[PDB]
Enzyme design. Structure first.
Site, PDB file in Angstrom:
ATOM      1  NE  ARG A 229      -3.867  -0.138  -0.643  1.00  0.00           N
ATOM      2  CZ  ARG A 229      -4.408  -0.012  -1.855  1.00  0.00           C
ATOM      3  NH1 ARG A 229      -3.892  -0.660  -2.906  1.00  0.00           N
ATOM      4  NH2 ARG A 229      -5.476   0.762  -2.017  1.00  0.00           N
TER       5      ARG A 229
ATOM      6  CG  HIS B 216      -3.021  -3.288 -10.157  1.00  0.00           C
ATOM      7  ND1 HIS B 216      -3.334  -2.901  -8.875  1.00  0.00           N
ATOM      8  CD2 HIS B 216      -1.920  -2.588 -10.503  1.00  0.00           C
ATOM      9  CE1 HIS B 216      -2.460  -2.004  -8.466  1.00  0.00           C
ATOM     10  NE2 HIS B 216      -1.591  -1.795  -9.437  1.00  0.00           N
TER      11      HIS B 216
ATOM     12  CB  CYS C 257       2.488  -2.531 -11.989  1.00  0.00           C
ATOM     13  SG  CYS C 257       1.832  -1.737 -13.463  1.00  0.00           S
TER      14      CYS C 257
ATOM     15  CG  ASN D 169     -10.231  -4.947  -8.572  1.00  0.00           C
ATOM     16  OD1 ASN D 169      -9.607  -5.900  -9.041  1.00  0.00           O
ATOM     17  ND2 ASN D 169      -9.659  -4.030  -7.805  1.00  0.00           N
TER      18      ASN D 169
HETATM   19 MG   LIG Z   1      -7.538  -6.591 -10.276  1.00  0.00          MG
HETATM   20 ZN   LIG Z   2       1.489  -3.503 -15.419  1.00  0.00          ZN
END
Ligand SMILES: [Mg+2]
Ligand SMILES: [Zn+2]
Ligand SMILES: [Mg+2]
Ligand SMILES: [Zn+2]
Ligand SMILES: [Zn+2]
Ligand SMILES: [Zn+2]
Lengths: 162, 162
Positions: A60, A97, A104, A118
């Site tokens: 985090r 992500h 990343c 998500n």
């Molecule tokens: Mg995800």
């Molecule tokens: Zn990436």
DNA sequence: TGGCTACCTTAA
DNA sequence: GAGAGTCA
DNA sequence: TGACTCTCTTAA
DNA sequence: GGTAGCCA
């Protein structure tokens, strides 16, 4: 409070700082037995992470900028969507992500969607496996598969039907 | 402790009491724009629930049987799999509803799998949508869809590439 | 048993 | 996948 | 800003 | 999704 122009200012300083994170080339399954390549801009493992970046937890981080004498902080991944709303259909939006790589921070591998959407991507077949996500996946979920279910449905007697 | 013979005894007494729970006919999407029918044996909303059944939580119950002067209690849905192991590849197994209906206790609508596998079914296209689960799904996840993602990936500058 | 109680583990 | 705080 | 620290949320 | 305690 903050002006649209001031916001944009932030996003841009963000993208720069982030832009210089080491780039990592990852091979990921897109589905359909096809392989692809992705490039994640991963934040360092330990301090210093970046200009204005800090670690509030294991995986985090937070971005902080002072403007007109007032400190502003946001989630290290929330910035790209500072102009976007914070709820869809009553559902709080977060940063997802698309590469499934926390460290990343490449905005090209991110999106603003509910907590459910998500998670879903986790089991998505991939853009080449048959993904149907409105905002297509750039890779197949890391959990997609037949599973390792131990026991299937079954009754001993015959008190039930399907 | 309990003998195999004693165990089966339990399961059978379970199936029996469960068999008399009201039966509910539900239409569910199997995928491929196809619709099917299912029959859930739903535990009552309030006491009395059944013989040896109790509510430890809103949507939580427990089955309890005394044997040779010692009380035994388990999860109202764990019984059907009392002979099966309790971990696969080091992952604790639980009971997953294939019908996605908690109150239902029909063992034909159940299975023993990890917590992740269980969750994944939530976004499965269905057995007619293209499910690939080893232990096929009885219906398409209730969360399957394109989603309501607010903002997709995007950069203002040009500091990144996919 | 009957019927409540209070507390627990998850990854994002 | 989030919030806020507090020394410097 | 730098770098650490804390608790919270979610339905399985 | 799951374990245990208490009192009739
Ligand atoms: Mg995800
Ligand atoms: Zn990436
Ligand atoms: Mg489930
Ligand atoms: Zn997808
Ligand atoms: Zn059912
Ligand atoms: Zn399935």
């Amino acid at each position: 409070a903050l002006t649209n122009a001031q916001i944009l200012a932030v996003i841009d300083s963000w993208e720069e700082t982030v832009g210089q994170f080491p780039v990592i080339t990852h091979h990921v399954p897109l589905g359909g037995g096809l392989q692809g390549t992705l490039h994640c801009y991963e934040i360092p493992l330990a301090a210093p992470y970046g200009v204005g970046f800090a670690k509030n937890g294991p995986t985090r981080w937070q971005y902080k900028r002072t403007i007109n004498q007032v400190v502003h902080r946001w989630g290290s991944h929330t910035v790209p969507f500072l102009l976007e709303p914070d709820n869809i259909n009553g559902k709080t939006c977060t940063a997802s992500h698309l590469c499934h790589n926390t460290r990343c921070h490449n905005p090209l591998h991110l999106c603003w969607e509910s907590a459910d959407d998500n998670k879903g991507r986790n089991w998505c077949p991939g853009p080449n496996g048959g993904c149907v996500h409105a905002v297509v996946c750039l890779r197949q979920g890391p959990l997609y598969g037949p599973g390792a279910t131990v026991a299937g449905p079954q009754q001993r007697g015959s008190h039930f039907v399907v």
